[PDB]
Paper text:
Subsequent cloning and characterization revealed the β-cell KATP channel as a complex of two proteins: a [name] [name].2 of the inwardly rectifying K+ channel family, and a sulfonylurea receptor [name], a member of the ATP binding cassette (ABC) transporter protein family. Physiological activity of KATP channels is determined primarily by the relative concentrations of ATP and ADP: ATP inhibits, whereas MgADP stimulates channel activity. As KATP channels set the β-cell membrane potential, this regulation by nucleotides endows them the ability to sense metabolic changes and translate those into changes in membrane excitability, which ultimately initiates or stops insulin secretion. Importantly, KATP channels are the targets of sulfonylureas, one of the most commonly prescribed treatments for type 2 diabetes, which stimulate insulin secretion by inhibiting channel activity.
The structure shows that the KATP channel is an octamer built around a [name].2 tetramer with each subunit complexed to one [name]. The complex is ~200 Å in width in the longest dimension and ~125 Å in height, and is shaped like a propeller with the [name].2 pore and TMD0 forming a compact central core and the [name]-ABC core structure forming the blades. In our structure, TMD0-L0 sits in between the [name] and [name].2 subunits and is the primary point of contact between the [name]-ABC core and [name].2. A comparison of closed (Kir3.2 apostate) and open (Kir3.2-R201A + PIP2) G-loop structures in relation to [name].2 suggests that this gate is also closed. Together, these observations indicate a closed channel structure, which is expected since the sample contained saturating concentrations of inhibitory ATP and GBC. An overview of the ATP binding site from the side, and from the top, with ATP colored in red, illustrates that the pocket is at the interface of adjacent [name].2 N and C domains. A close-up view shows that the docked ATP is surrounded by residues I182, L205, Y330, F333, and G334 from the same subunit, and R50 from the adjacent subunit. In our structure, we see that the density corresponding to ATP is located on the periphery of the [name].2 cytoplasmic domain, and traversed by the N-terminal segment of L0 of [name] immediately following TMD0, with the Cα of K205 coming within only ~10 Å of the site. Overall, the [name]-ABC core is in an inward-facing conformation, with the NBDs clearly separated. However, in contrast to other ABC exporters of known structure whereby transporter halves are related by either a true or a pseudo two-fold symmetry axis, depending on whether the two halves are identical or not, we find a clear rotation and a translation of TMD1-NBD1 relative to TMD2-NDB2, such that TMD1-NBD1 is ~15° off the symmetry axis and is translated by ~10 Å horizontally (relative to the membrane).
Author numbering:
A (entry chain B): 6 to 615, 678 to 705
B (entry chain A), D (entry chain C): 32 to 356
C (entry chain B): 1000 to 1044, 1061 to 1308
C-alpha cells in the first residue's frame, strides 16, 4: 500500500486515519480465517471419501434457502469479478503498484469458493457448526462494508465512483446473507436443545434412490454434471458398457415413476372445472395442469434471449478501444487515488468483459438447454398423463360400439399414438416460439442501431425466407404423403414378395421379379421424382442460407453506398446478428406448422374425448334406433 | 461368481440409506488414524501453515494500527522491533509458535494489546503441536501389518480321520514374534430357507473346533491343521464329494483373531473358501522335518496336497453304512 | 468403418461432386477472408470497391447449387442401385436358404433400410459434410488468425476427443435403447384395441392399467435419457467451446497489444469463436446422426 | 411408564447415601478425561496462566528486592536486564516457561537467589507441559463415538422357527471399519418374587444366544438377527401373545460389547425393549440383496416388519400341543 510516505501519513491521523489502507486490510483477515479453518474439514472429507467411505452410493439433504444461496454465490462472483476489474485499473495508473488496493477482492473469490464447499460438506453431513462459522464470517464482512461506506461518505463522490458501485453490490449480499443464517432447523443455540425438525432427515427422494440403480434426481447441483458422470463412468468402463448398453431399462431405476403418477393425477384435477368438456376447456385445463413449468421454462427461455442477444455488443468495444483507439494512451483523468465509475468500457475491461460474455454465453446455452430440458420433461409427463387418461378413458367408457364395430377404433389408436407424440412434439419448442419474436425484434432493433439498409436487407431476406420455408416444406410434406402412398405400394409388393417366397421358384422368380421389379420401379419412380422434389426443397434450404449471405453482401454494399462512412463494426458484429436470425427463421416456420399440427392434434384429442334373473330385457346394436332384441326372458340356475 | 470376501481379506459391502453423515464428521480421530501416510502429512503440514498465516496477519496489523513502521520516528518506540516488511511479521509469527527465539525482532511494553495477543498465539500453537503428537502415535501402533504375516493355504481338504469325516484347514506364521490368546472362529455362510417360508440371504452358522476340552485357541509357531468333524449338527452332513463342489455356490469364512506380543492391540485376519476352492480326497503334505538343531518347516509344500483313497459317499450315508455294519 | 459406404451409389461422381462442394466452401471462406481484408481496407480509411463488392458475390449461387449438387439426384442412383441391386441380389438367391430364414428381419431391415436410408440419408449426410467442413474451415481459419503460440489445439481435441469418444459410446447406447423402446407400446395398444370385450371379460381391468403405466413409464425414463444426451452434449460442447472463446480472447489480447494489431480480423476469431462452438455443437450432433444413419 | 434405560443408551440411576467424596476428588485423571472439550480447554488455559502469574510476581520481586530498576545506576548491574516495568517481568516469565528466548531480557551472575529460582520455574513449567500431553492424548482415544455407528432396530419380533418359538433382534453397522471379538449379552430385567416371600426389585436373568457351539459372538459386517429359543428355562415360556404386551411391564436389555480395529479400547452399546416395543406375528424384512459387484444392504427396511400367520398360544401350550400330538 506504500509508495513513498503513505504508511507514515496513515499512522499520524487518529482512528486508523479514517481507514486509508486499514479498511482494506480489515476485510482480509476474515477471509483468511474462513479459509484456514476450512482446509482441515475440507481436506479430511476429501481423503476419507477416497480410501474408505460408505457414503459413495446414496446421500442427499436439503436446507431452507438453497436457491437463494446459489443466487448469492453467483452474484458474489459477479461482484468479485467487478471489484478486481476496478482494481486492475487502479494498479495500472503506472506510478506505483499499491498491493493493498486489490487484495480484498482476491481473498473473497477464494473465500466464496470455500463457502460453496462448506455448503456441499454441510449438504452431505447435517450440522449447524458450519453455519455458525459462516455466520461469523458474514458478520465480520458486514462490519468491513460499513468502514468503506463510512470512509466514503466523508470522501464522497456520488455516482462517479466505481469502488462504491462494487461496495454497494457487495453490501446487498450481506443483507441477503442473513436469512440463510436465520435457519430454524439449526440447533446450535442454547434454546430448543432438541432437534427442531425431525422430519427433515428422512427424504422422499433418497428412498426413491436407495432402491434405485440410477437415482436421476432433480434435487442436485443443477449443472448437468452428475447426470452425466453416472452414465459416463459406466460408458467409460469397457466391461461395464456392454452390460449397461443392453440392460439399460433394468439399469434404469424408474425413479421419476413416483412423479409420473402425480402428473396423471394432476391432469384430472385440472379437468375438474365448473364447465363441460371442450377442446378449449381441455386446452386451457392442460395449460393450467402443467402449472409452473410452462411460464417458468418460458421465463428461463426469455433469460436465454437476454444473455444470448447481446452477445455481439461486447465485441464492438474491442474494435473501438483497440482498433479505433489507435493513439489514445491516456488511462484516467479523474481522481487517480481511487476508482471512478466512468470509462468502464476500457481495453482490459473489454477483455475480461469478453470473458464475461463467455460466462454469460454459458449462462445462455445453459439456461437454454435447461428450459429445453424442462420442456422435454413437460412433454414426457404430457404424453404419459394424457396417455393415462386416454387409455383409461377408452378402457372405462365402452360407448358407441357401432364405430367400434368397424376398424376405425384401431385408426383412432394409431392416430392417437402418432397424433399424441405429434402433440408432444408440437409442444416440444413452444417457449422457443414464445421467445423467437422477442429475439427477432431486439436483434432487429440493435441492427437498427447499426444502420437501416442492412436491416432492410437481412430482415427482407428472412421475410422472404420464411414462406419458402414452410410453403416449400409443405410441398415436401405433400411429397411425403404421395411418396408415402407409393412407398405403401412398395410395402404391399414387399409382402407380396413374401408371398413370392411362399410361392414356387421359377414362377415367382420370373413373374415376381419382373412384376415386383417393374411395379416397384414404378412406385419407386414416382417416389423417386417426389424424392427429387423433396431434395429440391432441401436444396431450396441450402440456397436459403446464401440468401442471408447475399443480404450480408447487399447489406454492406448498399448500406455502404447510401451513407458516407466506413467502419469494421457491422461486418463482424452484424454478421453475428445474421447468425442469430437463422435459428429463429426456420424454427419460426417450423413452430408455425407445429402450431397447425398442434391445433389439429388437440382437435383430434377433443374428437376422441366424446342364480340368474332376467326380466323383460331389450338389446340393441345401436341406441339411436329400436332395440334389435325385445322382451328376452330366460333364467339359468347355477 | 458372486463373492462375499476376498482370498486376502477386507470384504467390501455396499450400504444404502444413510441417516446422518454428521456423526461421522464429529468422530474425527478414528478417520484421521485410518487415513494413509501421504494425506496424513498433508493435514498436519497445511493446518500448521494455515495457522502460521493467521498469527502473521494480525501481527502485521498491530504494526499497521500503531503505524510506527514506515515513518521511522526516533522518539516513537515500536511494539516490536525490526518490522520493516510484511514478510517480517510472518517470520516473527513462526518464531513464537516454534519457540525459535531468533532475537532480531524484540517486543516492548508500549502496546498492551499485542502482548495479550502473543499469549493467545502461544497457547493455541502449543496446543496443536501437542494434539499432533497423539495423532501420529496412534498410527504408529496400528497392527494390521502384523496380521498379514499370518498366511492361509490355497485350498482346503476333506478326508476321514479315525473313522470320521473331517474338514481340514492349515495356517502358518512367517515371524519370530508370536500372537497371544488368539481365538479362531469359523462360520458357514449359506442362504438357508426355513420350513415356514422365510428366505434369509446369508445365514451364519458356527462349526466346532473339535478340541476335546472345548477349545478356543492353539499355540501357533509352526503350521497346524484345524479339523471339522461332520456330525448330525454339521450342515455338510448331507453333501456328496463330486456333487457338492459345483452344485452348491456357498462359502465358508475363516476368522483368526489375536494380540501382538509387542503391542496391546488385537488384530484379525480373514479369508474365504468357495465350493471350487475345496478339495476332496487329498491331504496336507507334512511341512515339519526334524534336523540336528531344530525342526524346520518348508513353505513350498504348504500349497501342496496329495491324493489318498477315500469314500465317495456322504456323511449321512457313511454313518448309515457303519450303523448297518 | 466407411469403406462399405464409399461404394454406395457410385464413388467417382460422388467424390467429384462432394469435392466440388468442398472447393465451393473453400470459395465461401475465401469470400469470408476477402470481406475481412476489404473490411481492413475500410478500416484503413472506394479503391477496389467494384472489385470487392462485385467479386465477393461470385460463389453464392455457385455454393448454393454446387454444395447441394452431390445429393441433388443422388437419391435416384441410390434408389435404383440400392433397391434394384438389393432386390436382384436377394432375388437371384435360391429360395431354400431364404425359405429357412425369419422373414421379419429380412423384410424389416430390407424395407426399413430402403425407406429410412433412402429418405433420411442425404439430409444428415450433406449436413454432416457441411458441418464438418465449416468446423475445420473456420477452425483453421481462426487458428491462422491466431499466432502459432495461440493455436493450443491439443487441449481442444483432447477434451473434444474425450467428448466424441465417450459420447459416441453412450450416445450409441442411448439412441439404441431409446430407439428400441417404442414398438411394444404400440403392440399392446393394438392388443388394447383388439381385446376390448376381453377387457370386459377381465374383471380386473387395472392389470393392463398398471402394466400400461409401467410401459409408458419406461418410455418416459428413456425420454429422460434422451434429454440427458442432449443435456451433456449441448452443455459439454458449448462449455468447451466457450473455453475456446476465452482462448480466442487471449489470442486477440496478445495479437492486439503484444505487437502491431491488424486493421481487420480481430473480431473474426470472436465471431468464429461463438460460431466455432456452434460448429462443435452441430458437428457433435451431426456426428451422432451420422453414427445412427 | 417407568424406565430403566433409554432407547439410545446411558441409563441414569439415582444414588443415595454417599460415604466420601474425597476418593473421587483424589482420583483426578478419570474425571479429567471424562469432561467435555470446552471445559477441558479452560482447565489447561487457566492453569497455565495461573502459573505464569506466579513466576512473574516473584520475578518482579527479585528486582524490587535488589532495587536496581528505578535508580538507573551505571555501576550497579541488574540481575536481569531491560526490566523497566511491572509487565516486563511477566513477559520474561512467559519466555522461560515456553522457551521463547527473545533475547531482550538478559540474566547475570549478580544475584545467586534468582538463578536457583529460575531453575524451579523451568522444571515445574516443563512438568505441567508434559502432564498436559498425556491428558489430551487420553481423550483422543475415547471410543464411545465408534460405538454409536452400532444401530439397533425400532421394535422386536417373536415367531416360531423350525417348530420352536423364538425372539428376534437385529443389529447393524454403518462403518467400513469393524469390531473384533465383540460378545453380546442379553438380560431380562423383571421384578421376581421367590416362594419364601422375598421381593427383589430388578432381577437379572440371562437368556441363551442359541449358537450351536456355545456362542459368545458373531462376525458383524451386515445386519444379522439374534434368536431366543423359548424352552423350559426361558421366563417367556408362560406368556401369551396379546396378553403379555400390556399386562406385563418389564424390559429386556441388549448388551453389545467389543473392540475397535483401530484402537485397543473396548466399547459398549446398550438399549432396552419394553412390553409395547415387542411385536408378535411379524418378522424382519430381508435387507441383503445380491448385485453384480457385491451384496447391498438397505437400511430403510431395517425398521420394517411384515406379518405372517402364527399361533396365538403360549410356549407351554405350544409344547403341550405338540407333546399330545
Ligand atoms: N454412605 C455410603 N456410601 C457409599 N459407600 C458406603 C457408605 N457407607 C459405607 N460405605 C461402604 O460400603 C460398604 C458397605 O458395608 P456397610 O454399609 O455395612 O459398612 P459398615 O459395616 O457400616 O462399615 P463402614 O463404617 O466402613 O461403612 C462399607 O464397607 C463401606 O466401605
Ligand atoms: N437411513 C438410515 N441409515 C442408517 N441408520 C438409520 C437410518 N434411518 C434410521 N436409522 C437408525 O437405525 C434405527 C433403525 O430403526 P428404524 O429404521 O425403524 O428407525 P425409525 O423407527 O424410523 O426411527 P428413526 O426416525 O430414529 O430412524 C433407527 O433407530 C435410527 O436411529
Amino acid at each position: 500500500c506504500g509508495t513513498e510516505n503513505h504508511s507514515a501519513a496513515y499512522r499520524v491521523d487518529q482512528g486508523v486515519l479514517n481507514n486509508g489502507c486499514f479498511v482494506d486490510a480489515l476485510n482480509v483477515v476474515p477471509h483468511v480465517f474462513l479459509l484456514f479453518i476450512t482446509f482441515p474439514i475440507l481436506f479430511i472429507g476429501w481423503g476419507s471419501q477416497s480410501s474408505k467411505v460408505h457414503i459413495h452410493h446414496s446421500t442427499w439433504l436439503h436446507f431452507p434457502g438453497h436457491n437463494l444461496r446459489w443466487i448469492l454465490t453467483f452474484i458474489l462472483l459477479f461482484v468479485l469479478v467487478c471489484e478486481i476489474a476496478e482494481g486492475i485499473l487502479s494498479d495500472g495508473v503506472t506510478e506505483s503498484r499499491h498491493l493493498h488496493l486489490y487484495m480484498p477482492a482476491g481473498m473473497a473469490f477464494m473465500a466464496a469458493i470455500t463457502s460453496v464447499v462448506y455448503y456441499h460438506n454441510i449438504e452431505t453431513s447435517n450440522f449447524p457448526k458450519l453455519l455458525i462459522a459462516l455466520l461469523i464470517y458474514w458478520t465480520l464482512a458486514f462490519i468491513t462494508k460499513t468502514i468503506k461506506f463510512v470512509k466514503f461518505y466523508d470522501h464522497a463522490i456520488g455516482f462517479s465512483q466505481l469502488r462504491f458501485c462494487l461496495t454497494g453490490l457487495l453490501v446487498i449480499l450481506y443483507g441477503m446473507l442473513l436469512l440463510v443464517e436465520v435457519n430454524v432447523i439449526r440447533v446450535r443455540r442454547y434454546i430448543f436443545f432438541k432437534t427442531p425438525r425431525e422430519v427433515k432427515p428422512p427424504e422422499d427422494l433418497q428412498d426413491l434412490g436407495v432402491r434405485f440403480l440410477q437415482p436421476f434426481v432433480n434435487l442436485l447441483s443443477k449443472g448437468t454434471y452428475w447426470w452425466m458422470n453416472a452414465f459416463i463412468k459406466t460408458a467409460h468402463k469397457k466391461p461395464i458398457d456392454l452390460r449397461a448398453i443392453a440392460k439399460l431399462p433394468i439399469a434404469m431405476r424408474a425413479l421419476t415413476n413416483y412423479q409420473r403418477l402425480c402428473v396423471a393425477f394432476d391432469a384430472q384435477a385440472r379437468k375438474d372445472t365448473q364447465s363441460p368438456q371442450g377442446a378449449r376447456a381441455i386446452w386451457r385445463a392442460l395449460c393450467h395442469a402443467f402449472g409452473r413449468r410452462l411460464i417458468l421454462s418460458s421465463t428461463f427461455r426469455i433469460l436465454a434471449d437476454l444473455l444470448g442477444f447481446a452477445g455481439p455488443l461486447c465485441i464492438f468495444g474491442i474494435v473501438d478501444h483497440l482498433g479505433k483507439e489507435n493513439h489514445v494512451f491516456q488511462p484516467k483523468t479523474q481522481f487517480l487515488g481511487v476508482y471512478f465509475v466512468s470509462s468502464q468500457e476500457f481495453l482490459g475491461n473489454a477483455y475480461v468483459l469478453a470473458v464475461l460474455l463467455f460466462l454469460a454465453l454459458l449462462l445462455q446455452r445453459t439456461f437454454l438447454q435447461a428450459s429445453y430440458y424442462v420442456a422435454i420433461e413437460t412433454g414426457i409427463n404430457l404424453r404419459g398423463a394424457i396417455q393415462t387418461k386416454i387409455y383409461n378413458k377408452i378402457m372405462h367408457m365402452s360407448t358407441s360400439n357401432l364405430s367400434m364395430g368397424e376398424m376405425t377404433a384401431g385408426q383412432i389408436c394409431n392416430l392417437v399414438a402418432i397424433d399424441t407424440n405429434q402433440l408432444m412434439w408440437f409442444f416440444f419448442l413452444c417457449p422457443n416460439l414464445w421467445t423467437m419474436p422477442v429475439q427477432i425484434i431486439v436483434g432487429v432493433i440493435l441492427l437498427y442501431y447499426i444502420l437501416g439498409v442492412s436491416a432492410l436487407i437481412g430482415a427482407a431476406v428472412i421475410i422472404l425466407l420464411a414462406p419458402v420455408q414452410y410453403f416449400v416444406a409443405t410441398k415436401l410434406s405433400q411429397a411425403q404423403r404421395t411418396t408415402l402412398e407409393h412407398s405403401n405400394e412398395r410395402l404391399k409388393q414387399t409382402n407380396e414378395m413374401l408371398r413370392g417366397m411362399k410361392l414356387l421358384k421359377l414362377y415367382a422368380w420370373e413373374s415376381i421379379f419382373c412384376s415386383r421389379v417393374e411395379v416397384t420401379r414404378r412406385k419407386e419412380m414416382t417416389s423417386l421424382r417426389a424424392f427429387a422434389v423433396y431434395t429440391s426443397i432441401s436444396i431450396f434450404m441450402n440456397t436459403a442460407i446464401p440468401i442471408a449471405a447475399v443480404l450480408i453482401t447487399f447489406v454492406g454494399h448498399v448500406s455502404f453506398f447510401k451513407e458516407s462512412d466506413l467502419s469494421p463494426s457491422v461486418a463482424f458484429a452484424s454478421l453475428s446478428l445474421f447468425h442469430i436470425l437463422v435459428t429463429p427463421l426456420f424454427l419460426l416456420s417450423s413452430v408455425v406448422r407445429s402450431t397447425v399440427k398442434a391445433l389439429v392434434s388437440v382437435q383430434k384429442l377433443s374428437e376422441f374425448l366424446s342364480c340368474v334373473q332376467i326380466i323383460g330385457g331389450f338389446f340393441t346394436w345401436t341406441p339411436d334406433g329400436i332395440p334389435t332384441l325385445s322382451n328376452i326372458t330366460i333364467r339359468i340356475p347355477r | 461368481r458372486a463373492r462375499f470376501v476376498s482370498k486376502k481379506g477386507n470384504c467390501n459391502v455396499a450400504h444404502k440409506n444413510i441417516r446422518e453423515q454428521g456423526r461421522f464428521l464429529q468422530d474425527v480421530f478414528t478417520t484421521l488414524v485410518d487415513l494413509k501416510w501421504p494425506h496424513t502429512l498433508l493435514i498436519f503440514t497445511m493446518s500448521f501453515l494455515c495457522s502460521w498465516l493467521l498469527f502473521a496477519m494480525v501481527w502485521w496489523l498491530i504494526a499497521f494500527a500503531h503505524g510506527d513502521l514506515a515513518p521511522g520516528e526516533g522518539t516513537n518506540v515500536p511494539c516490536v522491533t525490526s518490522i520493516h516488511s510484511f514478510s517480517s511479521a510472518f517470520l516473527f509469527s513462526i518464531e513464537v509458535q516454534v519457540t525459535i527465539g531468533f532475537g532480531g525482532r524484540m517486543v516492548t511494553e508500549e502496546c498492551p494489546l499485542a502482548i495479550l495477543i502473543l499469549i493467545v498465539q502461544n497457547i493455541v500453537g502449543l496446543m496443536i503441536n501437542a494434539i499432533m503428537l497423539g495423532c501420529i502415535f496412534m498410527k504408529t501402533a496400528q497392527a494390521h501389518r502384523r496380521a498379514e504375516t499370518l498366511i492361509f493355504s490355497k485350498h482346503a481338504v476333506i478326508t476321514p480321520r479315525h473313522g470320521r469325516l473331517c474338514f481340514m484347514l492349515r495356517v502358518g506364521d512367517l515371524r519370530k514374534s508370536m500372537i497371544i490368546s488368539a481365538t479362531i472362529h469359523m462360520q458357514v455362510v449359506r442362504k438357508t430357507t426355513s420350513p415356514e417360508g422365510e428366505v434369509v440371504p446369508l445365514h451364519q452358522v458356527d462349526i466346532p473346533m473339535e478340541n476335546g476340552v472345548g477349545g478356543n485357541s492353539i499355540f501357533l509357531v509352526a503350521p497346524l491343521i484345524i479339523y471339522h468333524v461332520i456330525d448330525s449338527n454339521s450342515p455338510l452332513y448331507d453333501l456328496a464329494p463330486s456333487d457338492l463342489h459345483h452344485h452348491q455356490d456357498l462359502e465358508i469364512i475363516v476368522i483368526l483373531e489375536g494380540v501382538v506380543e509387542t503391542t496391546g492391540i488385537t488384530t484379525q485376519a480373514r479369508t474365504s473358501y468357495l465350493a471350487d476352492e475345496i478339495l476332496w480326497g487329498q491331504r496336507f503334505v507334512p511341512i515339519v522335518a526334524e534336523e540336528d538343531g531344530r525342526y524346520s518347516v518348508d513353505y513350498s509344500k504348504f500349497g501342496n496336497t496329495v491324493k489318498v483313497p477315500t469314500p465317495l459317499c456322504t456323511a449321512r450315508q457313511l454313518d448309515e453304512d457303519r450303523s448297518l455294519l | 468403418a466407411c469403406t462399405k459406404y464409399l461404394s454406395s451409389a457410385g464413388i467417382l461422381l460422388l467424390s467429384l461432386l462432394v469435392f466440388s462442394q468442398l472447393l465451393k466452401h473453400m470459395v465461401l471462406v475465401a469470400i469470408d477472408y476477402w470481406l475481412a481484408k476489404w473490411t481492413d481496407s475500410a478500416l484503413v480509411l472506394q479503391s477496389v470497391y467494384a472489385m470487392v463488392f462485385t467479386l465477393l458475390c461470385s460463389l453464392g449461387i455457385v455454393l448454393c447449387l454446387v454444395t447441394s449438387v452431390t445429393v441433388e439426384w443422388t437419391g435416384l442412383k441410390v434408389a435404383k442401385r440400392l433397391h434394384r441391386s438389393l432386390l436382384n441380389r436377394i432375388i437371384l438367391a435360391p429360395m431354400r436358404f431364404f425359405e429357412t430364414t425369419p422373414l421379419g428381419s429380412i423384410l424389416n431391415r430390407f424395407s426399413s433400410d430402403c425407406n429410412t436410408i433412402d429418405q433420411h440419408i442425404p439430409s444428415t449426410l450433406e449436413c454432416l459434410s457441411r458441418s464438418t467442413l465449416l468446423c475445420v474451415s473456420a477452425l483453421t481459419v481462426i487458428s491462422y488468425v491466431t499466432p502459432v503460440f495461440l493455436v493450443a489445439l491439443l487441449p481442444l481435441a483432447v477434451v473434444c476427443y474425450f467428448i466424441q469418444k465417450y459420447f459416441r459410446v453412450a450416445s450409441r447406447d442411448l439412441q439404441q435403447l431409446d430407439d428400441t423402446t417404442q414398438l411394444p407400446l404400440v403392440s399392446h395398444f393394438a392388443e388394447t384395441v383388439e381385446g376390448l370385450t376381453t377387457i370386459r371379460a377381465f374383471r380386473y381391468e387395472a392389470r393392463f392399467q398398471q402394466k400400461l403405466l409401467e410401459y409408458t413409464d419406461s418410455n418416459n425414463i428413456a425420454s429422460l435419457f434422451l434429454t440427458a444426451a442432449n443435456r451433456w452434449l449441448e452443455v459439454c460442447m458449448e462449455y468447451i467451446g466457450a473455453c475456446v472463446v476465452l482462448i480466442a480472447a487471449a489470442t486477440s489480447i496478445s495479437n492486439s497489444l503484444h505487437r502491431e494489431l491488424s486493421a481487420g480480423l480481430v473480431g473474426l476469431g470472436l465471431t468464429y469463436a461463438l460460431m466455432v462452438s456452434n460448429y462443435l455443437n452441430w458437428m457433435v450432433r451431426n456426428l451422432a446422426d451420422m453414427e445412427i444413419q
